[PDB]
Scaffold this active site. Structure first.
Site, PDB file in Angstrom:
ATOM      1  N   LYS A 168      16.098 -18.688 -27.612  1.00 53.17           N
ATOM      2  CA  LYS A 168      16.355 -20.066 -27.220  1.00 53.17           C
ATOM      3  C   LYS A 168      15.241 -20.599 -26.331  1.00 53.17           C
ATOM      4  O   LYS A 168      14.857 -21.766 -26.440  1.00 53.17           O
ATOM      5  CB  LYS A 168      17.706 -20.172 -26.520  1.00 53.17           C
ATOM      6  CG  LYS A 168      18.869 -19.841 -27.427  1.00 53.17           C
ATOM      7  CD  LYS A 168      20.201 -19.913 -26.711  1.00 53.17           C
ATOM      8  CE  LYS A 168      21.313 -19.380 -27.598  1.00 53.17           C
ATOM      9  NZ  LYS A 168      22.655 -19.522 -26.975  1.00 53.17           N
TER      10      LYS A 168
ATOM     11  N   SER B 180      28.357 -21.317 -27.992  1.00 55.46           N
ATOM     12  CA  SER B 180      27.322 -21.535 -26.992  1.00 55.46           C
ATOM     13  C   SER B 180      26.892 -22.989 -26.894  1.00 55.46           C
ATOM     14  O   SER B 180      26.006 -23.297 -26.094  1.00 55.46           O
ATOM     15  CB  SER B 180      26.113 -20.660 -27.303  1.00 55.46           C
ATOM     16  OG  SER B 180      25.817 -20.694 -28.684  1.00 55.46           O
TER      17      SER B 180
END
Lengths: 346, 171, 171
Positions: free
Chosen positions: C122, C79
């Site tokens: 996140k 990611s």
């Protein structure tokens, strides 16, 4: 799942009970008489045979009850699951309508398993949230549509959208066979540097896949130099190859066809035609050797919106024994050489 | 094999033809014993093709990848060494072996041929298949001649000592 | 990360530019305790930055070190693809990225941005780290708008599908 620990070992008792040559005289401990048990039809369910002792496996007729594909699951849902859930929740068709297409979408995005209990759980979930909406007075008739399914069962466990609905040069769609079965992957190829050229490969690093990609690249270079000679890309250029890591080692090297197609598509600058997935290992001369997992590969082709797949010629019998609901809308091309795949990608 | 005699085809092919040397990828029979046997057989085939026809660089840099079928007891497994050497040499020289020929025997690192077991089963398998010539370790000739006369009547047997003789009677 | 989402800084910086001959290849040394998949993805991101900067020769004629800090769970490994590409591009072009800008999302060899997980974590970490602009893949738009109303209040968002858009909003 019988106990074989400290206290007792009833597996020997079962081995004496389920023996067809000693059923005629069972002789339990309470009655000292022997009872004939030869007419009893015994059935034993097991999840795995490994934990059954061999003298006991040898006494039973092992019948394998395999899972269901999406179409069998849909038939089960329409005929049994949804009616029984309607009865258990007190709803009918007029209050909450589960159609065949929304059920297909549910099975495709959420219930991607071998059994039926999870599909039943999802069906109960939808009907249950429907019943709550009705009782709380929000609505009087719920309508579950393939757009309105999201707020009933949550986030889809699997994604229908693929990495590329239209593939640029260098990337070709190939389908593979995983331990879960039925995967589709985009073999990608780019160039690193702006007089001999080299290949850099990433992905499912396997020692045999290394040589597989090597000889696929070599055959690609030779095929290019013989087909279009005034083109020197695949000889003077440094390129990078990437193979996604779905395929198990056995069929790891089964992507040679797609690798050659990717390298040639990049070197020619012409994209491959859409909705085309391919399989098959190549030899040095270009022979297309048979591949495994054709059932899973075909189901993956279907789920990924593919129409025309390409298979080795000697998988013809392996393919034409797959049911019509598995291979009805698919147009298949069977090939014994790479020139024919080249034609199939125009 | 555990079921009796059997007849299998040891197959070598080519894939991916002065800095590197050609490896070998055995695929059929897995196990450390057959692995070391295949290594020994490969090394002897290389040495044989070096001292005989020392020009062709084939067997040294080719990436052969042979394949030996899976049916054999773990003790009889290494009795495919001479068959492996002959398959490798045949693929190298580009010359198929004598047509109706069956062979069994363990090969040493220098080519000496060692005795094997299951002579009767192997003979019956070769006779059940179409075989007119059989090659056996010389130390198995007693075992061969103890069999019944209606088994060993339609095949000519060659009792070999060193693999140079198999190379003679196989090409 | 495991039970959290703490934001990380990837950084870049090996021999100095020779400027003598443009025949060499240049190299990327990567650290950060990467799994196999993470190292392959960092290599893919390297190649894509090199291809994106077709316009100069900083990616092709310089030796670089890449550091991605530890903490991202093995599933959440790749990611950091767009972050790696942006780090390399900013080092090459010699100009920083936007001052309060965070990103995430896997990058394929050709520039396609793949969805990631842990959008909630996140986002919480981005907001607590002073981040005002955040760049996400497109397929995570529903995942991001399924958040509470306070997990995003003054957080400028950009959903993207190809890295060219990330480049445009980062520079």
């Amino acid at each position: 799942k019988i106990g074989r620990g400290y206290q007792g070992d009833p597996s020997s008792a079962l081995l004496e009970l389920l023996d067809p040559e000693q059923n005629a005289n069972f002789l339990d401990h309470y009655l000292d008489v022997p009872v004939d048990l030869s007419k009893v039809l015994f059935i034993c369910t097991a999840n795995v045979t490994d934990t059954i002792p061999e003298p006991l496996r040898d006494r039973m007729e092992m019948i394998n009850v395999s899972g269901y594909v999406a179409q069998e699951k849909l038939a089960i849902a329409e005929r049994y699951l949804v009616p029984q859930a309607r009865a258990l929740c007190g709803l009918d068709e007029s209050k909450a309508k589960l159609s065949s297409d929304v059920l297909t979408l549910l099975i495709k995005q959420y219930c991607r398993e071998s059994g039926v209990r999870n599909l039943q759980k999802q069906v109960e979930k939808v009907l249950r949230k429907s019943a709550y909406k009705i009782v709380s007075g929000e609505a009087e008739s719920v309508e579950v549509t393939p757009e309105n399914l999201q707020d009933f069962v949550g986030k889809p466990v699997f994604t229908v959208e693929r990495m590329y609905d239209v593939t640029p040069p260098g990337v070709v769609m190939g389908l593979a066979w995983t331990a879960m079965g039925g995967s589709t992957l985009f073999v990608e190829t780019s160039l690193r540097r702006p007089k001999d050229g080299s290949l850099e490969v990433t992905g499912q690093l396997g020692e045999v896949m290394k040589e597989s990609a090597r000889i696929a690249y070599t055959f690609a270079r030779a095929f290019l130099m013989q087909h279009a000679p005034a083109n020197d890309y695949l000889v003077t250029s440094h390129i990078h190859l990437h193979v996604p890591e779905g395929a198990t080692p056995k069929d790891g090297p089964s992507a040679g066809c797609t690798i050659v197609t990717a390298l040639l598509s990049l070197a020619m600058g012409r994209p491959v035609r859409q909705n085309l997935a391919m399989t098959g290992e190549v030899s040095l001369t270009g022979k297309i050797l048979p591949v495994g997992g054709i059932k899973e590969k075909t189901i993956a082709a279907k789920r990924a919106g593919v129409t025309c797949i390409v298979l080795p010629a000697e998988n013809k019998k392996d393919f034409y024994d797959l049911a019509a609901f598995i291979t009805e809308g698919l147009e298949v091309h069977f090939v014994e050489h790479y020139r024919e795949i080249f034609d199939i990608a125009f | 094999t555990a079921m009796g005699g059997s007849t299998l085809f040891v197959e070598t092919s080519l894939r991916r033809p002065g800095d590197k040397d050609g490896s070998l990828e055995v695929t059929g029979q897995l196990g450390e014993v057959m692995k070391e046997s295949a290594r020994i057989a490969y090394t002897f085939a290389r040495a044989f093709l070096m001292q005989h026809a020392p020009a062709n660089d084939y067997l040294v840099t080719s990436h052969i990848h042979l394949h030996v079928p899976e049916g054999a007891t773990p003790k009889d497994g290494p009795s495919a060494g001479c068959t492996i050497v002959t398959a490798l040499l045949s693929l190298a020289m580009g010359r198929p072996v004598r047509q109706n020929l069956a062979m069994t025997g363990e090969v040493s690192l220098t080519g000496k041929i060692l005795p094997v077991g299951g002579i009767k089963e192997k003979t019956i398998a070769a006779k059940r298949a179409g075989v007119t010539c059989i090659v056996l370790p010389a130390e198995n000739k007693k075992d061969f001649y103890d069999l019944a006369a209606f088994i060993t009547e339609g095949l000519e047997v060659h009792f070999v000592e060193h693999y140079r003789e198999i190379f003679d009677i196989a090409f | 990360t495991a039970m959290g989402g703490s934001t990380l800084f990837v950084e870049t910086s090996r021999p100095q530019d020779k400027d003598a001959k443009g025949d060499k290849d240049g190299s990327l040394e990567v650290t950060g305790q990467l799994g196999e998949v993470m190292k392959e993805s960092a290599r893919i991101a390297y190649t894509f930055a090199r291809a994106f900067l077709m316009q100069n020769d900083y990616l092709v004629t310089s030796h670089i070190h890449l550091h991605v800090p530890e903490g991202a769970t093995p599933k959440d490994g790749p990611s950091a693809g767009c972050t790696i590409v942006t780090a390399l591009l900013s080092l090459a072009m010699g100009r920083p990225v936007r001052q309060n800008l965070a990103m995430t999302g896997e990058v394929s060899l050709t520039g396609k941005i793949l969805p990631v997980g842990g959008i909630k974590e996140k986002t919480i970490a981005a907001k607590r780290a002073g981040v005002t602009c955040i760049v996400l893949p497109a397929e995570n738009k529903k995942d991001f708008y399924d958040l509470a109303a306070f997990i995003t209040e003054g957080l400028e968002v950009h959903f993207v599908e190809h890295y060219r858009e990330i480049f445009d909003i980062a520079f």
